[PDB]
Design a protein around this motif. Structure first.
Motif, mmCIF file in Angstrom:
data_model
loop_
_atom_site.group_PDB
_atom_site.id
_atom_site.type_symbol
_atom_site.label_atom_id
_atom_site.label_comp_id
_atom_site.label_asym_id
_atom_site.label_seq_id
_atom_site.Cartn_x
_atom_site.Cartn_y
_atom_site.Cartn_z
ATOM 1 N N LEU A 7 -35.598 7.251 -23.279
ATOM 2 C CA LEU A 7 -35.826 5.685 -23.445
ATOM 3 C C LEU A 7 -34.748 4.914 -23.068
ATOM 4 C CD1 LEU A 7 -37.466 4.989 -26.938
ATOM 5 C CD2 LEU A 7 -38.589 5.593 -24.818
ATOM 6 N N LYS A 8 -33.562 5.047 -23.234
ATOM 7 C CA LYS A 8 -32.454 4.545 -22.882
ATOM 8 C C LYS A 8 -32.529 4.636 -21.284
ATOM 9 C CE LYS A 8 -27.468 3.905 -23.016
ATOM 10 N NZ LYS A 8 -26.206 4.708 -23.222
ATOM 11 N N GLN A 9 -32.715 5.782 -20.520
ATOM 12 C CA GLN A 9 -32.525 5.823 -19.270
ATOM 13 C C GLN A 9 -33.579 4.801 -18.516
ATOM 14 O OE1 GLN A 9 -33.414 10.035 -18.389
ATOM 15 N NE2 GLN A 9 -30.996 10.472 -18.861
ATOM 16 N N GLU A 10 -34.895 4.981 -19.147
ATOM 17 C CA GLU A 10 -35.867 4.085 -18.563
ATOM 18 C C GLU A 10 -35.800 2.649 -18.901
ATOM 19 O OE1 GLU A 10 -38.511 5.523 -16.755
ATOM 20 O OE2 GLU A 10 -37.466 7.346 -16.859
ATOM 21 N N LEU A 11 -35.177 2.269 -20.041
ATOM 22 C CA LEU A 11 -34.764 0.740 -20.036
ATOM 23 C C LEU A 11 -33.812 0.394 -19.069
ATOM 24 C CD1 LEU A 11 -34.666 -1.741 -21.365
ATOM 25 C CD2 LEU A 11 -33.358 -0.827 -22.998
ATOM 26 N N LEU A 12 -32.894 1.136 -18.762
ATOM 27 C CA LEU A 12 -31.929 0.971 -17.486
ATOM 28 C C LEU A 12 -32.692 0.834 -16.272
ATOM 29 C CD1 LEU A 12 -29.007 2.914 -18.893
ATOM 30 C CD2 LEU A 12 -28.792 0.119 -18.425
ATOM 31 N N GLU A 13 -33.580 1.628 -16.094
ATOM 32 C CA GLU A 13 -34.393 1.609 -14.670
ATOM 33 C C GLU A 13 -35.180 0.359 -14.698
ATOM 34 O OE1 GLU A 13 -36.736 5.277 -14.166
ATOM 35 O OE2 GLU A 13 -34.895 6.314 -15.421
ATOM 36 N N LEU A 14 -35.686 -0.272 -15.666
ATOM 37 C CA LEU A 14 -36.479 -1.426 -15.701
ATOM 38 C C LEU A 14 -35.552 -2.428 -15.459
ATOM 39 C CD1 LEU A 14 -39.184 -2.300 -15.509
ATOM 40 C CD2 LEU A 14 -39.096 -2.331 -18.140
ATOM 41 N N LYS A 15 -34.494 -2.661 -16.174
ATOM 42 C CA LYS A 15 -33.556 -3.642 -15.754
ATOM 43 C C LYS A 15 -33.427 -3.759 -14.340
ATOM 44 C CE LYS A 15 -30.423 -3.681 -19.851
ATOM 45 N NZ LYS A 15 -29.268 -4.181 -20.437
ATOM 46 N N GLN A 16 -32.969 -2.631 -13.659
ATOM 47 C CA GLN A 16 -32.758 -2.800 -12.279
ATOM 48 C C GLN A 16 -33.979 -3.137 -11.398
ATOM 49 O OE1 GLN A 16 -30.066 -1.992 -10.356
ATOM 50 N NE2 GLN A 16 -29.273 -1.971 -12.334
ATOM 51 N N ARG A 17 -35.133 -2.893 -12.004
ATOM 52 C CA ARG A 17 -36.267 -3.523 -11.270
ATOM 53 C C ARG A 17 -36.543 -5.061 -11.616
ATOM 54 N N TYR A 18 -36.090 -5.250 -12.663
ATOM 55 C CA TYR A 18 -35.997 -6.961 -12.993
ATOM 56 C C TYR A 18 -35.005 -7.640 -12.115
ATOM 57 C CZ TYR A 18 -34.155 -10.920 -14.896
ATOM 58 O OH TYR A 18 -33.510 -12.301 -15.016
ATOM 59 N N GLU A 19 -33.841 -6.932 -11.727
ATOM 60 C CA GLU A 19 -32.987 -7.675 -11.063
ATOM 61 C C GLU A 19 -33.637 -7.483 -9.457
ATOM 62 O OE1 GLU A 19 -30.160 -9.291 -11.526
ATOM 63 O OE2 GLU A 19 -29.659 -8.406 -13.628
ATOM 64 N N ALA A 24 -36.047 -10.653 -5.130
ATOM 65 C CA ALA A 24 -37.333 -11.104 -4.306
ATOM 66 C C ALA A 24 -37.917 -12.538 -4.559
ATOM 67 C CB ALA A 24 -38.232 -10.177 -4.609
ATOM 68 N N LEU A 25 -37.976 -12.792 -5.565
ATOM 69 C CA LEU A 25 -38.380 -14.278 -6.139
ATOM 70 C C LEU A 25 -37.445 -15.241 -5.338
ATOM 71 C CD1 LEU A 25 -38.921 -14.159 -9.821
ATOM 72 C CD2 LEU A 25 -40.468 -15.384 -8.122
ATOM 73 N N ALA A 26 -36.181 -15.125 -5.302
ATOM 74 C CA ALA A 26 -35.347 -15.706 -4.506
ATOM 75 C C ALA A 26 -35.361 -16.103 -2.793
ATOM 76 C CB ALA A 26 -33.871 -15.621 -4.776
ATOM 77 N N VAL A 27 -35.549 -14.608 -2.299
ATOM 78 C CA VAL A 27 -36.189 -14.597 -1.109
ATOM 79 C C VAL A 27 -37.244 -15.475 -0.799
ATOM 80 C CG1 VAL A 27 -37.122 -13.268 0.788
ATOM 81 C CG2 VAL A 27 -35.218 -12.338 -0.529
ATOM 82 N N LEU A 28 -38.500 -15.339 -1.478
ATOM 83 C CA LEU A 28 -39.389 -16.268 -1.349
ATOM 84 C C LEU A 28 -39.331 -17.546 -1.590
ATOM 85 C CD1 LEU A 28 -42.847 -15.734 -0.625
ATOM 86 C CD2 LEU A 28 -43.073 -15.234 -3.327
ATOM 87 N N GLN B 22 -45.097 -7.504 -9.943
ATOM 88 C CA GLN B 22 -44.951 -7.139 -8.410
ATOM 89 C C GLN B 22 -45.921 -7.244 -7.617
ATOM 90 O OE1 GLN B 22 -41.523 -6.733 -7.853
ATOM 91 N NE2 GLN B 22 -42.037 -4.547 -6.429
ATOM 92 N N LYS B 23 -47.442 -7.064 -8.261
ATOM 93 C CA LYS B 23 -48.438 -7.336 -7.554
ATOM 94 C C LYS B 23 -48.818 -8.822 -7.166
ATOM 95 C CE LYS B 23 -50.528 -3.248 -9.002
ATOM 96 N N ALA B 24 -48.162 -9.635 -8.173
ATOM 97 C CA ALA B 24 -48.357 -11.250 -8.056
ATOM 98 C C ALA B 24 -47.448 -11.684 -7.038
ATOM 99 C CB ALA B 24 -48.180 -11.914 -9.530
ATOM 100 N N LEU B 25 -46.142 -11.084 -7.106
ATOM 101 C CA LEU B 25 -45.105 -11.611 -6.086
ATOM 102 C C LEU B 25 -45.864 -11.410 -4.531
ATOM 103 C CD1 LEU B 25 -41.559 -10.459 -7.180
ATOM 104 C CD2 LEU B 25 -42.002 -12.546 -6.111
ATOM 105 N N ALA B 26 -46.405 -10.226 -4.502
ATOM 106 C CA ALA B 26 -47.111 -9.819 -3.244
ATOM 107 C C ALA B 26 -48.333 -10.913 -2.781
ATOM 108 C CB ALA B 26 -47.515 -8.604 -3.224
ATOM 109 N N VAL B 27 -49.041 -11.164 -3.813
ATOM 110 C CA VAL B 27 -50.050 -12.403 -3.522
ATOM 111 C C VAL B 27 -49.429 -13.591 -3.005
ATOM 112 C CG1 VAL B 27 -51.596 -13.731 -4.797
ATOM 113 C CG2 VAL B 27 -51.673 -11.273 -5.123
ATOM 114 N N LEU B 28 -48.215 -14.103 -3.743
ATOM 115 C CA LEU B 28 -47.654 -15.092 -3.200
ATOM 116 C C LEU B 28 -46.978 -15.255 -2.141
ATOM 117 C CD1 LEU B 28 -46.687 -18.215 -4.063
ATOM 118 C CD2 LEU B 28 -45.133 -17.042 -5.761
ATOM 119 N N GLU B 29 -46.494 -13.871 -1.465
ATOM 120 C CA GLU B 29 -45.924 -13.625 -0.422
ATOM 121 C C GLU B 29 -46.990 -13.645 0.667
ATOM 122 O OE1 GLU B 29 -43.922 -10.095 2.328
ATOM 123 O OE2 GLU B 29 -44.297 -9.772 0.349
#
Ligand code: NA
Ligand code: NA
Ligand code: NA
Ligand code: NA
Ligand code: NA
Ligand SMILES: [Zn+2]
Ligand SMILES: [Zn+2]
Ligand SMILES: [Zn+2]
Ligand SMILES: [Zn+2]
Lengths: 38, 38, 38
Positions: A7-19, A24-28, B22-29
């Motif tokens: 659980l702790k590993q997976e939460l950290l993995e998701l934090k990275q995906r969030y980041e 990517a939001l900022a690129v767009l 992620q899929k929504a980012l892709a739609v907006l892209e």
């Protein structure tokens, strides 16, 4: 081990995906602005 | 209070929401591209 | 090794971050639309 530490590993993995998605939001966001003043 | 099965369930729930964003980012892209190219 | 209260706390913090990203996606969506139907 392989369960609560899992659980702790997976939460950290998701934090990275969030980041990654914030970046990517900022690129767009910059792509929209270039369209906007172009 | 702190139910470990609840934590695991909620982590999985949030993973699916990550996936949907992620899929929504892709739609907006693609929408941005439609305006860049026209 | 793993602090379970901390794991719950961090999951709720990531949930808030997801909710903010949803709202940011929506803001960008409106911006794109503004460029589109302009
Ligand atoms: Na795309
Ligand atoms: Na892509
Ligand atoms: Na891609
Ligand atoms: Na182009
Ligand atoms: Na609405
Ligand atoms: Zn829930
Ligand atoms: Zn603690
Ligand atoms: Zn924290
Ligand atoms: Zn919409």
């Amino acid at each position: 081990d392989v369960d609560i530490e899992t659980l702790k590993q997976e939460l950290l993995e998701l934090k990275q995906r969030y980041e990654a998605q914030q970046k990517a939001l900022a690129v767009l966001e910059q792509r929209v602005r270039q369209v906007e003043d172009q």
